[PDB]
């Protein structure tokens, strides 16, 4: 029997969090450390770590660091659980104490738009007795070459794993008609096709349809933050009605969106500000 570690991850009770939350600057992480078969009544010092996955372990790309001393006690033990004896032994010894982890949001986002999921992790380290030259709230210093006696610094653990989420937006388009006259048109108005493209450039997608007069479509999932542009097949609208096309874009909620080539409109969707986005092109026909 030799001493381990293990940690349970999480934030409020979960296992992830609104990473796009604008009334947060900060987030913990409860970082609930797991002792095996540790000896009572010694004092060890343990130092906890929070990365982004992709540079989990990497000195200097750390989120945030604790370090704290542990007296191991009795009134400390729990329940071990299967995997812990799966890996330890039936008989491991478990013991709980906990520390907190704290990230700004800032951190995590970069203040820029927050296109997907990103993965964060915990490192945990076990230093026994004596084998330290100091500790302070946030590293502990070794004696020279003197390492941990046990570590957690495992990238694919789930039970050190948080998931910092973010929120989306949507962009709806109406298409509306002014102006048709029928001596003009080549085709029957409730018959009428107005092709679009939406764009959004933090989201990388581009989408395609077509919407009748008086039709909608709506684009989900668009990142917090987004430029999203919207283009009407002009020269197809004209050939239609037989009459030049003047679109007309406007959005509810106050909204804006800005059209510099008949035809284009680009709108944000949601801050770094309404999210759910609606918007109208008019297509007003005159001679």
Not at 55 to 72: I, N, P, Q, W, Y
Not at 89 to 106: C, F
């Amino acid at each position: 029997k030799k001493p381990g570690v293990g940690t349970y991850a999480t934030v409020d009770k979960l296992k992830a969090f609104d990473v796009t939350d604008g009334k947060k600057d900060a987030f913990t992480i409860k970082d609930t450390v797991r002792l095996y078969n540790v000896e009572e009544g010694k004092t060890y010092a343990i130092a906890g770590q929070l990365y982004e996955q992709s540079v989990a372990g990497d000195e200097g790309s750390a989120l945030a660091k604790a370090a704290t001393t542990v007296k191991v006690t009795a009134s400390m033990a729990k329940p071990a659980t299967e995997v812990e004896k799966t890996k330890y032994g039936e008989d491991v010894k478990v013991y709980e104490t906990e520390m907190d982890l704290t990230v700004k949001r800032e951190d995590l986002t970069k203040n820029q738009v927050v296109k997907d999921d990103i993965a964060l992790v915990v490192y945990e380290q076990l230093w026994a007795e004596g084998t330290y030259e100091k500790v302070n709230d946030t590293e502990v210093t070794p004696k020279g070459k003197s390492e941990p006696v046990a570590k957690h610094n495992d990238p694919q653990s789930s039970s050190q794993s948080i998931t910092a989420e973010p929120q989306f937006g949507s962009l709806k388009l109406t298409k509306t008609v002014t102006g048709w006259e029928d001596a003009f048109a080549k085709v029957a108005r409730p018959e009428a096709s107005y092709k679009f493209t939406v764009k959004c450039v933090q989201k990388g997608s581009v989408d395609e349809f077509t919407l009748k007069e008086g039709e909608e479509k709506t684009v989900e999932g668009i990142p917090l933050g987004d430029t999203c542009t919207i283009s009407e097949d002009v020269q197809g609208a004209v050939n239609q009605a037989g009459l030049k096309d003047t679109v007309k874009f406007t959005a509810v909620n106050g909204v804006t969106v800005d059209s510099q080539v008949n035809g284009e409109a680009v709108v944000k969707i949601g801050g770094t500000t309404v999210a759910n986005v609606e918007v109208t092109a008019e297509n007003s026909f005159s001679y």
